[PDB]
Design an enzyme around this catalytic site. Structure first.
Site, short mmCIF file in Angstrom:
data_model
loop_
_atom_site.label_atom_id
_atom_site.label_comp_id
_atom_site.label_asym_id
_atom_site.label_seq_id
_atom_site.Cartn_x
_atom_site.Cartn_y
_atom_site.Cartn_z
N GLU A 215 0.82 -1.20 0.00
CA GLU A 215 0.00 0.00 0.00
C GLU A 215 0.86 1.25 0.00
OE1 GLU A 215 -3.17 -0.60 -0.37
OE2 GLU A 215 -3.16 -2.72 0.16
N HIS B 233 -17.16 -12.15 -10.69
CA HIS B 233 -16.95 -11.19 -11.76
C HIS B 233 -17.93 -11.39 -12.91
CE1 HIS B 233 -13.20 -11.36 -9.47
NE2 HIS B 233 -12.96 -10.13 -9.89
#
EC number: 3.4.17.23
Lengths: 597, 194
Positions: free
Chosen positions: A357, A487
């Protein structure tokens, strides 16, 4: 007084009005993500529909400007991003039906229960319920029930809806001067307007097919080794020459093979590398973690973080007085606001994601000087690749021993690097044929090359041949297996997870060649060398203003994608695999099935 | 000798907008810039043509204190030889400036939670502003050649825009309280001297 000037003024007024709405939407979503409540549950809807109304009027007004009168590439990429009509071309009734279908499929997926009615104890939630029943179980029939009953219920209610969805999306696509929904989804790799770096929509299939054939022998030897090692656990349900059944791959569908490492460890007596057992005893919390992680980025020449980053970032769990979902994302609120909200835990997995991150935020801060519409990665696979090598270069024993996570004399032997390489390979080489096959079936069905009666025949026909996986039970036309994935049910694309894996190893080989490193590519570390950072920064600052082919060439030296660096990264394990596969059988037969008796 | 009232120029609770910048005439007062250096709060103190050491030995006829509020990453445009959205439409500095530009942060004072939309600036203009002039209007700007008669329609817009100042904005967008002390020499007696 001309078309380019009118587009410029339009973009100026759009830019100086969109940020003050996006920022309030971002702030309201931040506060909600802090506090899970029904009090502010409608502020997301308010912010979303306010900015949506703004964007819709802007896109509707944007169509009076043609794209043939513009010569400036910057303005052309800016205007082409606003002219995408989307689903507004359809009629009102058709759009209402489309939205109803889209909502219905998602509601069915999210509120879908699977249970065995006869036994009351055979009932559990999804996460951490039906998701962990497929992760740490070594039973055959118990796994088979959870595999079959999830698609026999949730997927059988999505078939007529998916057929209507297919026809409606084909109608939508054919009205924006496109061919099919597949051509719609392939349009983000399309490059034009430059000389020497052009890319076409039909060339992606050719390039992917070329790379697959090169990769096939390495995956073939890995597949043989894994199949041979899995014979010990399931000796009475597999054939030593055929395929691998689909309900034994470590999770619900088979996207990753990671959870198979506990059964396929080469040297089981060698102590695996461990840092969870040290982080507990090292008085290590998020504050010290971030303090250390800053130093690594400073070492190679990257700048420092801001004052508000420390104050406004939420780190550790706020107890049970409130709820929060922290599915993995970093945060960029705009207007110069960078924060982070992570699920802190005492585990091996968390040092790495802190660095990950951190790299995400570094990439965000690199291109903050680009205009509003161009503040993004080169394509949909570039942002996740630059945060993955930062974790690669920080876990090496050269680096850990200097920051103490490892012992001062943790010995390096060939009985440990092989374990590390196989752990790496299980997650990376076990997914590429899966992504390839799913996108291939999707493309052919959208093109109409498969008639309805062959929807569920060709699916298993390609599954059995390309990836070497067969089904436990036969499925007729009433089923819909591909729709059982997240998805697919939420209409997300899938080829980015194929391209980013290719890009990342090219990047790492280039960087550790330029850092003047001698030895195997998997023992390399770029810390304390500013040249590698200065080489990565020039690509990072570009954003969306350049084609991705040029972006790739500016670092590595080639305009295409290659698998030679990946094969070179895995060559030490490839030699070991070939040496161990002398007496085994390499290859699979497509005429085998577990239920053909 | 009275104390020169720099409090109303440096610590006022509400300031002006950049397109409507307030201009204070300081004359016949003993301004003390020695305390300015040691305030430990001035994020930017740059003088063109004069020096902070020489600032306490030079006596000037008049002191124009032009005071306003802008973003942080924009004070660099307050200088001779710059281009941007503010150096040509709102407030421009001539190439022969001989004064000081004093700027300091005001994040916790000139900001409120939920926004502070009391400060505004121009966005569209047909020409460029010559040095040291200010223009205030709400006329409709015509991008093309339709034309439009006072209606916000097809390529017709409103030129004023508001600053979205809040507590948590980044250093580049935080409110900076800018005073441009314009030293100049005229044909009048000079007694504004420390």
């Amino acid at each position: 007084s001309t078309i380019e000037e009118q587009a410029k003024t339009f973009l100026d007024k759009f830019n100086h009005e969109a940020e003050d709405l996006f920022y309030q939407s971002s702030l309201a979503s931040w506060n909600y993500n802090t506090n899970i409540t029904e009090e502010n549950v409608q502020n997301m809807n308010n912010a979303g529909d306010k900015w949506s109304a703004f964007l819709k009027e802007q896109s509707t007004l944007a169509q009076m400007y043609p794209l043939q009168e513009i010569q400036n590439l910057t303005v052309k990429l800016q205007l082409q991003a606003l002219q995408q009509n989307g689903s507004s071309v359809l009629s009102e009734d058709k759009s209402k039906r489309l939205n109803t279908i889209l909502n219905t499929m998602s509601t069915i997926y999210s509120t879908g229960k699977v249970c065995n009615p006869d036994n009351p104890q055979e009932c559990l939630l999804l996460e951490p319920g039906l998701n962990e029943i497929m992760a740490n179980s070594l039973d055959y029939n118990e796994r088979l029930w959870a595999w079959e009953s999830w698609r026999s219920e949730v997927g059988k209610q999505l078939r007529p809806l998916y057929e209507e969805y297919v026809v409606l999306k084909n109608e939508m696509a054919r009205a924006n001067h496109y061919e099919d929904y597949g051509d719609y989804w392939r349009g983000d790799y399309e490059v034009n307007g430059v000389d020497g770096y052009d890319y076409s929509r039909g060339q992606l299939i050719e390039d992917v097919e070329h790379t697959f054939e090169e990769i096939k022998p390495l995956y073939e030897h890995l597949h043989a080794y894994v199949r041979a090692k899995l014979m010990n656990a399931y000796p009475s349900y597999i054939s030593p020459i055929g395929c691998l059944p689909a309900h034994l791959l470590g999770d619900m569908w088979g996207r990753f093979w990671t959870n198979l490492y506990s059964l396929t460890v080469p040297f089981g007596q060698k102590p695996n590398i461990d840092v969870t057992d040290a982080m507990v005893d090292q008085a290590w919390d998020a504050q010290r973690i971030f303090k250390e992680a800053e130093k690594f980025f400073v070492s190679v020449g990257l700048p420092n973080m801001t004052q508000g980053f420390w104050e406004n970032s939420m780190l550790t769990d706020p107890g049970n007085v409130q709820k929060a979902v922290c599915h993995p994302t970093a945060w960029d609120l705009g207007k110069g606001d960078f924060r982070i909200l992570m699920c802190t835990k005492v585990t091996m997995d968390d040092f790495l994601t802190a660095h990950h991150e951190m790299g995400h935020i570094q990439y965000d801060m690199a291109y903050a000087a680009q205009p509003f519409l161009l503040r993004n990665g080169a394509n949909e696979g570039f942002h996740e690749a630059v945060g993955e090598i930062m974790s690669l270069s920080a876990a090496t024993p050269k680096h850990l021993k200097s920051i103490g996570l490892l012992s001062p004399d943790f010995q390096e032997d060939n009985e440990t690097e092989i374990n590390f390489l196989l752990k790496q390979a299980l997650t990376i080489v076990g997914t590429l044929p899966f992504t390839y096959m799913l996108e291939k079936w999707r493309w052919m069905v959208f093109k109409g090359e498969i008639p309805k009666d062959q929807w569920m025949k060709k699916w298993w026909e390609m599954k059995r041949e390309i990836v070497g996986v067969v089904e436990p039970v036969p499925h007729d036309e009433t089923y819909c297996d591909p729709a059982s994935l997240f998805h697919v049910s939420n209409d997300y694309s899938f080829i980015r997870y194929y391209t980013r894996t290719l890009y990342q190893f090219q990047f790492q080989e280039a960087l550790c060649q330029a850092a003047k490193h001698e030895g195997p590519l998997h023992k390399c570390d770029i810390s304390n060398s500013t040249e590698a950072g200065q080489k990565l920064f020039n690509m990072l600052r570009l954003g969306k203003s350049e084609p991705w082919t040029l972006a790739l060439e500016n670092v590595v030296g080639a305009k295409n994608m290659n698998v030679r660096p990946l094969l070179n990264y895995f060559e030490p394990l490839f030699t070991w695999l070939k040496d161990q596969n002398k007496n085994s059988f390499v290859g699979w037969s497509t005429d085998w099935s577990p239920y053909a008796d | 000798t009275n104390l020169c009232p720099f409090g109303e120029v440096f610590n006022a609770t509400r300031f002006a907008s950049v397109y409507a910048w307030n201009r204070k005439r300081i004359s016949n007062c003993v301004a003390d810039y020695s305390v300015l250096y040691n305030s430990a709060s001035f994020s930017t103190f740059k003088c063109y043509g004069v020096s902070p050491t020489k600032l306490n030995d030079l006596c000037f006829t008049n002191v124009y204190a032009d005071s306003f509020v802008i973003r942080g990453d924009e004070v660099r445009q307050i200088a001779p030889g710059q281009t941007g959205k503010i150096a040509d439409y709102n407030y421009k500095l001539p190439d022969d400036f001989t004064g000081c530009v004093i700027a300091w942060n005001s994040n916790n004072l000139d900001s409120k939670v939920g926004g502070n939309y009391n400060y505004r600036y121009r966005l569209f203009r047909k020409s460029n502003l010559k040095p040291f002039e200010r223009d205030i209007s709400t006329e409709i700007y015509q991008a093309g050649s339709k034309p439009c008669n006072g209606v916000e329609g097809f390529n017709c817009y409103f030129p004023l825009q508001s600053y979205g100042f809040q507590p948590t904005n980044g250093v580049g967008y935080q409110p900076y309280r800018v005073v441009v002390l314009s030293f100049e020499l005229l044909h009048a007696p000079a007694t504004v001297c420390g």
